């Protein structure tokens, strides 16, 4: 019931992605039996300080999706103003400002945007937020040697 | 050494996919630590008997990739002339005719082509190959009720 509608919605999101796959992103569920676990990658955008870097994500969708957002974690360590120690992200689109008409594509696009411009307000990683502004060269070194 | 060059090649394949993602397909590795396991989906092409159906794959790449192809299996049951009982596929591109300059994109494109036109010669599933030709209506029913 709850899980029937969430499975149908994830399949609808999958249909959207395959018809018009977004650039900079890869993403696919673990399997049909594990449709609620997706793995994704995002590549650092051109003209960003993360340009060309590759970053690895897992999205774990709840059974009442899309009433609630997936849990989103970076599964490879990252040094980023908007990512907590355990890899969880700080992004209002998938937290307090979640909308039930957002899709997997919405989510991946919004995560990619954190590599276009980090959010400096109330950062999850304050050292990363300060270093990003104060010393971009050293910030790049910390990203690489994480 | 062997595994360093295979990791670099998988990251290169990942870069190709994110820059120009192919339509009809989703695909992403499990994680960086498990870069050798990818999950993918293919959607039944327009004008095929599988039109709009969604099919689920796992690709397990060996440590000496791209000298050897990944093992490719459908992880959801499928009734298809070129798929064995355990989900393994019969496709020369990823078997005897593997080329070391093929990529993940090459592989996914070639698997998608089995849903454009099945291969009738020496089929892995002879009942499916016969039914596909002899009774398309019943073949569609067997696909759906697998
Ligand atoms: Cl849940
Ligand atoms: Cl191996
Ligand atoms: Mg878009
Ligand atoms: Mg192509």
List the helices and strands and how they pair.
2 copies of one chain form a homodimer.
Chain A lengths: L1 H18 L5 E5 L7 E7 L10 E7 L10 E4 L29 H11 L11 H9 L1 H9 L2
Antiparallel strand pairs in A: 1-2, 2-3, 3-4
Helix pairs in contact in A: 3-4
The structure holds chloride ion (2 copies) and magnesium ion (2 copies).
What does this structure look like?
The structure is a homodimer of 146-residue chains. Chain A is an alpha+beta fold and 146 residues long. Chain A has a single domain (1-146), classed as Ubiquitin Conjugating Enzyme, CATH 3.10.110. Helix content of chain A is 32%, strand content 16%. The first copy, chain A, has helices spanning 2-19, 104-114, 126-134, 136-144, and strands at residues 25-29, 37-43, 54-60, 71-74. In chain A, strands 1-2-3-4 form a four-stranded antiparallel beta sheet, with helices on one face. In chain A, strand 1 and strand 2 form a beta hairpin. The first copy, chain A, is elongated, with a radius of gyration of 16 Å. The interface between A and B is medium-sized, with 31 and 31 residues. The site of one chloride ion has 2 residues of chain B, from loops.
């Amino acid at each position: 019931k709850m899980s029937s509608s969430s499975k149908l919605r994830l399949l609808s999101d999958l249909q959207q992605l395959q018809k018009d796959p977004p650039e900079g992103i890869t993403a696919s569920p673990e399997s049909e039996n594990d449709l609620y676990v997706w793995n994704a990658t995002i590549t650092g955008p051109m003209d960003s300080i993360w340009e060309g870097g590759i970053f690895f994500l897992r999205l774990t969708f709840p059974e009442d999706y899309p009433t609630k957002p997936p849990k989103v974690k970076f599964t490879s360590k990252i040094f980023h103003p908007n990512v907590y120690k355990d890899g969880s992200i700080c992004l209002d689109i998938v937290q307090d400002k979640w909308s039930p008409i957002y899709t997997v594509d919405s989510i991946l696009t919004s995560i990619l945007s954190l590599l276009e411009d980090p959010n400096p307000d109330s950062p999850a990683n304050p050292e990363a937020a300060k270093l990003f502004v104060n010393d971009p060269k050293e910030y790049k070194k910390r990203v690489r040697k994480c």
